[PDB]
From Swiss-Prot, chain A:
Family affiliation: Belongs to the peptidase T1B family.
Record keywords, A-Z: Cytoplasm, Nucleus, Proteasome
Protein name per Swiss-Prot or TrEMBL: Proteasome subunit beta type-7
Single GO biological process annotation from the record: proteasome-mediated ubiquitin-dependent protein catabolic process
Main function: Non-catalytic component of the proteasome which degrades poly-ubiquitinated proteins in the cytoplasm and in the nucleus. It is essential for the regulated turnover of proteins and for the removal of misfolded proteins. The proteasome is a multicatalytic proteinase complex that is characterized by its ability to cleave peptides with Arg, Phe, Tyr, Leu, and Glu adjacent to the leaving group at neutral or slightly basic pH. It has an ATP-dependent proteolytic activity. PRE3 and PRE4 are necessary for the peptidyl-glutamyl-peptide-hydrolyzing activity.
Name of the gene this protein is made from: PRE4
Pfam family, one: Proteasome
Cellular compartments per GO CC: cytosol; nucleus; proteasome complex; proteasome core complex, beta-subunit complex; proteasome storage granule
Origin superkingdom: Eukaryota
Subcellular location: Cytoplasm; Nucleus
Annotated PANTHER family: METALLOPROTEASE TLDD (PTHR32194), PROTEASOME SUBUNIT BETA (PTHR32194:SF6)
Miscellaneous field: Present with 16900 molecules/cell in log phase SD medium.
PROSITE patterns for the chain: PROTEASOME_BETA_1, PROTEASOME_BETA_2
Organism of provenance: Saccharomyces cerevisiae (strain ATCC 204508 / S288c) (Baker's yeast)
Curated annotation (Swiss-Prot), chain B:
Protein name: Probable proteasome subunit alpha type-7
Endpoints of the signal sequence: none
Subcellular location: Cytoplasm; Nucleus
Assigned keywords, A-Z: Acetylation, Cytoplasm, Nucleus, Proteasome
Family: Belongs to the peptidase T1A family.
GO annotation, biological process: proteasomal ubiquitin-independent protein catabolic process; proteasome-mediated ubiquitin-dependent protein catabolic process
Free-text description of this protein's post-translational modifications in UniProt: The alpha and beta forms are probably products of the same gene with different post-translational modifications.
Species in which this protein is naturally found: Saccharomyces cerevisiae (strain ATCC 204508 / S288c) (Baker's yeast)
């Protein structure tokens, strides 16, 4: 048993017609101190998977090394390491889920919530969640932390059920994701303006965008707000 | 006598006969070589086609360690696999504590100490392989060869197995004719030729050529197998020189 020290906030994601999108801001908080400002929390695995991680950053860095070591190992004595015997999103997830549950079962968890986003060999979208308890689940949209409370409601208006996925283009999905990130920036005290976003598309592969910013922010209406009830000036 | 019946026993002339007998298993294996080039290393091996029924390209022999090291060996293939498994553990544990991928000389000693350990006791048998290995690290390219005694040194080129004498002389010509060095691409071509030449001592059967390389410029310092067009072109260049 421990307690998280340096932490990352929400990871948010959804499925669309040809793939998946995942996003997470670039902050590592130290309680209420916004300590570290260039932390990458989306970690690509090969060209078909992106693992997004929230919670304890020291444990995130450990998991990141496990994933890197997974790639090294899969290539061993494997002539088809960059073809039929490449790592799938589903292999990477099952492995992480096994580790998370094992660690919880030993009363020594990896203090994280994780979303594995990718596209399988057969073109199928993969999106699944696992956390420090070993709890796993799938949905057309997934989000951790604050994102679960604020991003999901918005993302579910785009894809509310399985049949909405083929009707959702990458442009509509990305815009939904980017808006959710703005909303989290407004309302989550441990969020940052700077984030990363990754698209895994079955046709165009993995697009990884860094140094994105929240823009088109509404603050002007604040000039008219005075006092807390009766004050006029 | 009876000095040769048990590993780690010194004979009256100061020898470990069980290690010398391990060398016989090595000398009995197929030919394998390595060539250190300008910014990398090339590895190649003769694979005897015992039968038509062997699926071509499918019984791969050269092995990667970490992402930057290639290993090839002649002798008892399972012993070589055991040694590479250990090398993979050593590389992982080095990278885990120190972050940086294991340097080639550091990796050489890890294999050397392990192989040497198998000459200290009569409860184990020495390794029946000689291993040629190397790659690129922060100080450049490195090629090594390691024997059943645990002995290793760095090399300009190296060869072992049944066609070792022929390969050596070929390798010596290259060292003499190129003091400035060999390009990685030249080294691949040369490696194909030398395996073709050395295959005389093994002419009974046909064989299949297998090459790999790590080059700063050609593979970004990662170990890769030479496949398809570049492989064919080296096979062709070899066929020409034996004709």
């Amino acid at each position: 048993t421990q307690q998280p020290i340096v932490t990352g906030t929400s990871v948010i994601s959804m499925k669309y017609d040809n793939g998946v999108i995942i996003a997470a801001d670039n902050l590592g908080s130290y309680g209420s101190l916004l300590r570290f400002n260039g932390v990458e929390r989306l970690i690509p695995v090969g060209d078909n998977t992106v693992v997004g991680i929230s919670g304890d950053i020291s444990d995130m860095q450990h998991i990141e090394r496990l994933l890197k070591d997974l790639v090294t190992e899969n290539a061993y004595d494997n002539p088809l390491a960059d073809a039929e015997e490449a790592l799938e999103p589903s292999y990477i997830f099952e492995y992480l889920a096994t580790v998370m549950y094992q660690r919880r079962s030993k009363m020594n968890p990896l203090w994280n919530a994780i979303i594995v986003a990718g596209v399988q060999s057969n073109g199928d979208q993969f999106l699944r969640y696992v956390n420090l308890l070993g709890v796993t689940y799938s949905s057309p949209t997934l989000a951790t932390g604050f994102g679960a409370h604020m991003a999901n409601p918005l993302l579910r208006k785009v894809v509310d059920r399985e049949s909405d996925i083929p009707k959702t283009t990458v442009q509509v999905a990305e815009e939904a994701i980017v808006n959710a990130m703005r909303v989290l920036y407004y309302r989550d005290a441990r969020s940052s303006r700077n984030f990363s976003l990754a698209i895994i598309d079955k046709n165009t592969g993995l697009t990884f965008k860094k140094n994105l910013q929240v823009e088109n922010m509404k603050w002007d209406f604040a000039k008219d707000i005075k006092g807390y009830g009766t004050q006029k000036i | 006598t009876g000095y040769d019946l048990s590993n780690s026993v010194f004979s009256p002339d100061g020898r470990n006969f069980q290690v010398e007998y391990a060398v016989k298993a090595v000398e009995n294996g197929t030919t394998s070589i390595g060539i250190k080039c300008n910014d990398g290393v090339v590895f190649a091996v003769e694979k005897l086609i015992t039968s038509k029924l062997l699926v071509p390209q499918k019984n791969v022999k050269i092995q990667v360690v970490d992402r930057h090291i290639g290993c090839v060996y002649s002798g008892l293939i399972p012993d070589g696999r055991h040694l590479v498994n250990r090398g993979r553990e050593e590389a992982a544990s080095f990278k885990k504590l120190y972050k940086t991928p294991i340097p080639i000389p550091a990796f050489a000693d890890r294999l050397g100490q392990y192989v040497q350990a198998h000459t200290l006791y009569n409860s184990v048998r020495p390794f029946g392989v000689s291993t040629i290995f190397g790659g690129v690290d922060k100080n450049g390219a490195h090629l090594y060869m390691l024997e059943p005694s645990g002995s290793y040194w760095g090399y300009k080129g190296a060869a072992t197995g049944k066609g070792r004498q022929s390969a050596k002389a070929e390798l010596e010509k290259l060292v003499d004719h190129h003091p400035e060095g060999l390009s990685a691409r030249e080294a691949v071509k040369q490696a194909a030729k030398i395996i073709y030449l050395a295959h005389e001592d093994n002419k009974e059967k046909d064989f299949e050529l297998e090459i790999s390389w790590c080059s700063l410029s050609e593979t970004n310092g990662l170990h890769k197998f030479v496949k398809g067009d570049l492989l064919q072109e080296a096979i062709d260049f070899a066929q020409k020189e034996i004709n």
